[PDB]
Symmetry: C4
Amino acid sequence: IQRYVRKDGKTYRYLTDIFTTLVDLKWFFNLLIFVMVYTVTWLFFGMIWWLIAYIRGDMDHIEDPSWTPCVTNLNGFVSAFLFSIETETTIGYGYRVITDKCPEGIILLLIQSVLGSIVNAFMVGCMFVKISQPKKRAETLVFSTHAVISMRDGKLCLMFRVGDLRNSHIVEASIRAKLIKSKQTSEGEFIPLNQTDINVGYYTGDDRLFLVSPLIISHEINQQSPFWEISKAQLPKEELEIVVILEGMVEATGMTCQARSSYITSEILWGYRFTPVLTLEDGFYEVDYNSFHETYETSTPSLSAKELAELANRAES
Amino acid sequence: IQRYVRKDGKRYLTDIFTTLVDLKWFFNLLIFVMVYTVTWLFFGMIWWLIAYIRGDMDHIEDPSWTPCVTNLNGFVSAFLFSIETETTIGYGYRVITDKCPEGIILLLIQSVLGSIVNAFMVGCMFVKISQPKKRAETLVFSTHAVISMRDGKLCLMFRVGDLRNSHIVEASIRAKLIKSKQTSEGEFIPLNQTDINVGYYTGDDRLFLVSPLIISHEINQQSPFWEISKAQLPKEELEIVVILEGMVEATGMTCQARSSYITSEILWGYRFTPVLTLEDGFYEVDYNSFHETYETSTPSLSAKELAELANRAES
Amino acid sequence: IQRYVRKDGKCNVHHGNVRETYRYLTDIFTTLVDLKWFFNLLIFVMVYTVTWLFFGMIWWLIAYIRGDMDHIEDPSWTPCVTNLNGFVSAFLFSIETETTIGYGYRVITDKCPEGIILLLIQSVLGSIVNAFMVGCMFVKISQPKKRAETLVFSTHAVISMRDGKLCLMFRVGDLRNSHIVEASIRAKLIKSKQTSEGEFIPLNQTDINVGYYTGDDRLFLVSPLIISHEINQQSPFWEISKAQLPKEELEIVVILEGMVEATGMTCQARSSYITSEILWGYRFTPVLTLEDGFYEVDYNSFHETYETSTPSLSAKELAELANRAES
Amino acid sequence: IQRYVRKDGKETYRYLTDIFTTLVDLKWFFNLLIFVMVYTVTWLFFGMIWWLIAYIRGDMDHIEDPSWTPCVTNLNGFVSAFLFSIETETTIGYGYRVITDKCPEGIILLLIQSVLGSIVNAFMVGCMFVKISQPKKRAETLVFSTHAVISMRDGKLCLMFRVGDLRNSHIVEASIRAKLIKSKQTSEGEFIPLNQTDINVGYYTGDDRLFLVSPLIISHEINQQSPFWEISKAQLPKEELEIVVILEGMVEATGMTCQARSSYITSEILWGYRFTPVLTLEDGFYEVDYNSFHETYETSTPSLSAKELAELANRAES
């Protein structure tokens, strides 16, 4: 079995999801604003046309055929409003047509047409911006419901599982992780919240990922990491939050998708280990998503990372 | 009290209106209004031209002669026909007849040109509000930056946040120092730029704007402030330029906002006041005290002198 | 001869101007056609049709509120829509109104408030459909990172000797010269490893240094370039040997991101290597042939033929022998 | 003095309009000529099929007979069909020629015409956006120094070259990287004729993100990691190397990014030279002399390369 060879790697769903999202969103937000923005200007132009009719007073000569009204077949407010909505939207049925005997009518038609073009351009731009975004969120790219600190290669390591559900919509990505918690400092300069970056491979470029399967991304706990002074017993009391952002993720189509999750002090487990999601066999591999979040307890020292390093130094010396 | 969601954090019409206002009517709207009007006027002129050439004007009320365009016997009539055809309304009171090939080709040209103009309209509306570098987007910076003691080391910190809602949480922050440096070789560079690290080595530049932070840069041996003292600062003429870029949660567009600090705006021995106050299950922000700063007790010696004193005390 | 690139142009003979009108039209046609063929058009057709059909059904229904088919013959009664009798009439009116045509043979009459609101909804829904449609067509073009078939990788990565160190190198190039430049490369290796604690990782990813520390991963690519990675302590290949290589069954992926000088867009290329495609103790054959005043590139023969002798043993053992002989 | 104190950002509308008009004066003929033919082809094809549907319907037998309802009212064979096609496709619909309900296939034909016209309008907008909103541009306002020099700076051998813009307000932030291209022969018998080696102009510390408010002298140090470590003054002419410099930045006026490129040869690198100061500060204001952007003046620097300089420094220290 080979990953791939000189290739990318080895569509009704997307359209259906987009249609469902649009249908869900259109009930409350879209139907109100997008309709009212046209309705207000159409009503405004209706009042303007009615005011011009009143100035010309063609209702008095509505039955009179000798008079030439500004707009043919104008009888009342509803007639003017209907003429306005006809003209502005570029329909022009013809039962009512502007005559050639009033320059004010020509000026109004020009203004209405250009303003309607502007409104349509605004409509298209707003629809494009709202529906299409350079970095849209993705329902895939689920994170592990737990982050586990475990024992790896002589050093403690915090890891969380991240992967893609569709097995093809994510190949390349990047990951960043920030711990937010409050300090006190030696000078008493209390800070209600502090952000510190936990290294996940920024120096070595390991932060970039080729996601072909679920990956257990492991942070390394060293003398330059926030968790360097925490232990098993001290973890529950201290309240800290971890925010993990995965970005720069193409979908083998071209756009960029983003995802974000977090972990709380009650959501971090000590001394556990992720259950492997992939099992190999002669000629084949099998991955079962049912064990994506499954974790099993393993033996590990309960001392702090600094305490573990001190114990190792004492034993070596 | 949590600052997360499983897929998000813990309106758009206003942003669109602000973008339209920034684009402004004078820059774009008036120009395209004029181009539309001149287009319609020119095509009305050519409609009069073809009507005169054919002679349709002479036989205004001749049933035998079928005109090129029905009921077109005046300049205002020709202008109405032009504006109706170009904008694709087609009332029908004025209709073309088949027996005029010149009218046919003119209609073809006018339709093509009108579609082109509409495409130009939309493309212009797909440029002024589609650039990937927006305005400041109300991402204010602290009017002052302070230098003081933290973690036992002298550091320079300035407050960064957004007075609007927490609708944007992503930022890369860079800070340059502009100063005139006299080289030991005698060369004088009047505008010298030196980058001060804010976490570039550790990747700490990519910060989370969940709340107004106090961005702090350590004053180490590499830092340009390695020789700046309390009395040295007033007589210097340095400058700091801070540029922060970030993408909003609404759309992938990125806004870039930057500010500057002159030597007057930098204070020695002060500290920012806290802006977040917590309570039993609820947190609050006093955005009034965003720029507030209170004096603290810090040594007046330079960072080099602090290091020398620490070395002497250790020795 | 040097690449003065004073106007961002490599000093190389170019024939891109010849048949440029044919070539650009052909590629913009093919790229647009390949995605849709009959996949976009069908969806467009069904959504427009079902919208129009829906409008027609509701127009027929509102006509079935005594507005017509009761006094159609009688001229005194004024229907909601002039000349609207059957379902076909309703469909033909909905298609005219929604498409912003409005011939006027069938036109709504002002004396029906229920029709004005219906037209109000129909016109705005049609405009929304059109705007969404233009956006859906547009998003195909706006996507960056378009696939590039012009970038090629060497079919055989090779480990060899370089300046006293073991180095793993492979050639990367562009099909035509002066098309892609300032490309960025990144190489990872996928391998199953077992920790000392008994933990098993069926798929472990490790980035191999190709210049990320020094920013050397951004290569100009004027000629087929032999991208090389030096084996050090941090290099995962530091433990493997000549005999271990056929038995490792490790895998390597390489990703290259560049910008096309013609349009300024972004392009991506991706390649893989297996333990069978990594030959030990070989070396690439040069593709450039310099001469007085001119260089010759035999790109038609990539010279993926290799030949070498001397390298053996491993990386760790070689270094150990090095400092043992040194001291 | 008081540089960028304001937080507003401290080329007119007429200039932008003139530039747009100049671009249009060349582009509009190209676009019209290349697209009108296929527009006419589409309309003529649809007019032909609108004629054929009537012909197979055979309504010409009752052209003068109003008793029999035709597919479309008041239609002639060769010309009027094309008129109806153009009146319908582009959403005009005068109404003098209107479809009738008596023919079923006319509805299908109209549906096809409308959907295809929508596709063509989408093509209009796509082509217009591609033509007017190209994502990359080659700005000519950024000029590199015609000469790069090597001199002394704080006891270190440093290679500098001058960069900057022309209108002083187009490019304000830009990243810079430089690669040396040289043929190298290894001790193992390898001969790579085109060896690329990046020279750090501040990539380690992020110093490459220049804030361009004035012509700036970019300086690259010489150390163990610098390829110029062994390059002596006498050795420099014989090296026949080459340097390529790339500078990408973001346009202040429009969020679109711009890129510039330049190169230097062994004959364009001078020993012991300094850029003359382009910008001089006076009382109350500064003055920038763009005429001295490329001007350089000789200065006294040691002729030995960096290695002998380091050896001499070590010997003096010892």
